[PDB]
Subunit: 145 residues, 3 copies
């Protein structure tokens, strides 16, 4: 109805404001319709997935050049690598999102995937490029909502 249009405006305004506050505080990064955020912790892959899901989100994963630079900037800011939301399929060499879908956008550091042993997980360098690796290292936890 009439009052309906009104209320919707106020709500939109408020959400924008709170999103502005968290942005200014640097506690979140908005890219398109994805929101990236970190609590500053550096734990292993399994642990990170828990944190994100516990918070209502998911371990972060870039699907576009812009989302990738957004996550890299957080990594750069904390001077630590980031574990991305993806693991290697059954047939080595290929990676898939946790939902099971196979990865589309990639940004491997020249030569990767390449490595010592299994290397089923993916870490992001502070420059944004990816490197496959083990899942037991301590990496900055970054989630997407």
């Amino acid at each position: 109805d009439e009052e309906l249009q009104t209320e919707l405006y106020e709500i939109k305004h408020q959400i924008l404001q709170t999103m502005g506050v968290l942005s200014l505080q640097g506690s979140m990064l908005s890219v398109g319709d994805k929101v990236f955020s970190t609590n500053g912790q550096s734990v292993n892959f399994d642990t990170i997935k828990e944190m994100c899901t516990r918070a209502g989100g998911n371990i972060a994963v870039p699907r576009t050049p812009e989302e990738n630079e957004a996550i890299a900037s957080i990594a750069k800011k904390y001077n630590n690598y980031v574990y991305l939301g993806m693991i290697e399929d059954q047939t080595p060499g290929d990676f898939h999102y946790l939902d099971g879908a196979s990865v589309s956008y990639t940004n491997w550091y020249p030569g990767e995937p390449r490595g010592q042993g299994k290397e089923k997980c993916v870490e992001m360098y502070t420059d944004g490029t990816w490197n496959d690796r083990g899942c037991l290292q301590y990496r900055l936890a970054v989630c997407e909502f």
Copy 2:
């Protein structure tokens, strides 16, 4: 209308995201439709009520086993007891919510209510159990929204 369904979806998405960010940062705890939060201050009862109301909320009070454990976890995290949103009625022994209603859910430490003198307020131990007491101690301020 049509565009209406759309806008409602975006709004819901955004709220969820911001709520996810505050959860990940550990600045809030969501339980059912209640949100618990603390600013880390340790002040007396009167002071706590002011803080909560000033922030648009109310001094926290558990009404279910789950809300109780949620508040205890915050108490445990800060290693301090929490003053709950309740005071003793006119007739000693009984407690009521600040709205005037008489308490339903309780989780007294074995023996409580029991104590030295008046003990009109209620503090929560780090294990979740309650103990009645004075209202002038310095306790962690926790609010519910």
Copy 3:
């Protein structure tokens, strides 16, 4: 429809809750429909405008006695002066909001506008009164959303 009224209620509730959390944490100040917030940085005027706009807001500017005291309180809290969202028009003596409109509400410290040289910007004293000045000083960044 029916379910519509329901969803609107939940949304309003959630927004209120998150706004309560940011208020309790002291990360934002709500005055009427304006939200003021600071990241604690002390940079020059140009830099401040960037921060605010980058966060989806604008450099703060009081338009009522209440908004003015709200900003002063933040200034008082950080013990630093605040650059306001306004610059001097083409004809010295008069100031305008960044949108181009000429200022309405003012709260100059007795004697101001008055000063050394150009003084095209406006800083707020910790008591709330304004003083015109250069735009290259390091002042607390405060944004409005």
